[PDB]
Write a protein that binds this ligand. Sequence first.
Ligand SMILES: *[C@@H]1O[C@H](CO)[C@@H](O[C@@H]2O[C@H](CO)[C@@H](O[C@@H]3O[C@H](CO)[C@@H](O)[C@H](O)[C@@H]3O)[C@H](O)[C@H]2NC(C)=O)[C@H](O)[C@H]1NC(C)=O
Ligand SMILES: *[C@@H]1O[C@H](CO)[C@@H](O[C@@H]2O[C@H](CO)[C@@H](O)[C@H](O)[C@H]2NC(C)=O)[C@H](O)[C@H]1NC(C)=O
Ligand SMILES: [Cu+2]
Ligand SMILES: [Cu+2]
Ligand SMILES: [Cu+2]
Ligand SMILES: [Cu+2]
Length: 533
Amino acid sequence: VAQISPQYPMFTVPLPIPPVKQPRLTVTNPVNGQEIWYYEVEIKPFTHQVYPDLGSADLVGYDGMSPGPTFQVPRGVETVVRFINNAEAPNSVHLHGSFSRAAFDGWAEDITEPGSFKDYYYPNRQSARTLWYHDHAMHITAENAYRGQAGLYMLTDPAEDALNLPSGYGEFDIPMILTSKQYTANGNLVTTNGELNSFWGDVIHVNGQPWPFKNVEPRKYRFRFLDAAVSRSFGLYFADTDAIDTRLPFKVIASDSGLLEHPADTSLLYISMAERYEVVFDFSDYAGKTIELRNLGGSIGGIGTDTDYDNTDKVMRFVVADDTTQPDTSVVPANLRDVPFPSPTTNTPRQFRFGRTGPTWTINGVAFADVQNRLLANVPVGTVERWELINAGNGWTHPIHIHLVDFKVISRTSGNNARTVMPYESGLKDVVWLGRRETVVVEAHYAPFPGVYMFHCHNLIHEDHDMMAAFNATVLPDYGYNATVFVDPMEELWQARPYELGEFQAQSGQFSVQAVTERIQTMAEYRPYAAAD
Ligand SMILES: *[C@@H]1O[C@H](CO)[C@@H](O[C@@H]2O[C@H](CO)[C@@H](O[C@@H]3O[C@H](CO)[C@@H](O)[C@H](O)[C@@H]3O)[C@H](O)[C@H]2NC(C)=O)[C@H](O)[C@H]1NC(C)=O
Ligand SMILES: *[C@@H]1O[C@H](CO)[C@@H](O[C@@H]2O[C@H](CO)[C@@H](O)[C@H](O)[C@H]2NC(C)=O)[C@H](O)[C@H]1NC(C)=O
Ligand SMILES: [Cu+2]
Ligand SMILES: [Cu+2]
Ligand SMILES: [Cu+2]
Ligand SMILES: [Cu+2]
């Protein structure tokens, strides 16, 4: 299909890298004595230029940048972020991949209007993994993310750093935030408002950059891949600019929840919205040349339904250098980690069906906005449940995300005989792609925190209208751990707070180090994430 967005001079701009995020301070957690990093993220409108000739894009991002700044949080240390809505429409932040407490996870109605803020308290207790934070405000999540509200966040671990993979953000450890958008003639974004099926977009970006280049060295590299698009799934492969139809093969080191048990040797990476895979690519043998990362056309090989455009088969270009400026000491081992799969159950799976009821995308025929029927499962905490995710349709694809949890992919059956379980789905994830006529079952231990959590399709057009539901992690009244105050995401105690706007830049009022400090220490005392120890 012919491109709508103006013509772009491609592979002409070097790959941008989002800066890391700095905490404002630390606060002493009175329970254990440890400290707590505290960030302050403002959400403001800003204007950015993509088409080097004319026109700027009207955005709204985390700190006035899309993608928002990146978080490298060492495991163990609890972290806390204040999100300050200085924008034009409500917001609700989700840190995709953290088993936070219900009121810190980005419940779609737990929202912050402009002229207010809200503090999120994150445990940072899980395994090394790559996470991202995005808006989750009800029914406007597509457009809030489309315009810039998303970013990186890495739960790191020095133990696995003792594997000497290509290390170091920005040089051997590079982020790949894939989006797919569309622009006006004048240069501005075209709104996702009014789309009821999918917004594919005809312009491909990495780190907010349409069709860019990166010069590299003939050595192993770590690439972190994230499909942050609204509706587009990707089918990625590498090919030498001179046999563009030949797939260069690579190694997939980690999925959404972290490393797989063994590097998945592959040559084509199926990746849908919100999925994360980490790839290492030996640029060893391609010295001198110029490798191109491409996107599988034909609606991702008949897995999906995406509309392809003139230039949505190209993602970006890699220029290998003539020589390594210093040799490749980095390494990729063959055993990677022990993966804590959940102790298998044998029970019959719970069934969730993802379709539309007339014009509305539903799960088992209910729409998120339907408060009565929104809750579709009660799972007592500590339960393991297999869940069967069913896309019976031929004209829609559905990457299904479940909050709090990390699950193992048990099975996929494709009505189109298209595929079975893929080799990089052997570890742990929190998002699975239901392709055309696909049914998947996943297994996950529902632990360790009670609370009311979301699950939904991560096609933001679908999610917004209205393919999203809720499950309740249940305990008995004798449980404890203060759970009585962390199960309701709308708990009036963790809600947003108005702020006098100029007191934010003066660090007065609620932002004085002591108010900042009293509040966090107040917060810490509740021992929120203590059930994980
Ligand atoms: C999700 O599940 C949680 C439990 O994990 C539910 O919280 C529970 O809500 C019930 C209300 O039906 C509470 O029981 C009642 O509390 C009142 C107040 O003391 C008491 O007078 C009654 O005799 C009865 O015990 C229960 O304590 C509470 N449990 C916890 C741990 O908070 C929650 O309602 C569920 N959410 C949804 C949306 O259904
Ligand atoms: C449940 O929540 C309370 C609220 O913070 C936890 O902490 C104590 O709360 C009392 C007031 O209820 C304060 O006077 C104490 O100062 C708090 N403790 C500390 C060390 O400051 C309480 O510990 C929590 N219980 C569990 C089991 O997590
Ligand atoms: Cu998400
Ligand atoms: Cu999520
Ligand atoms: Cu969907
Ligand atoms: Cu979600």
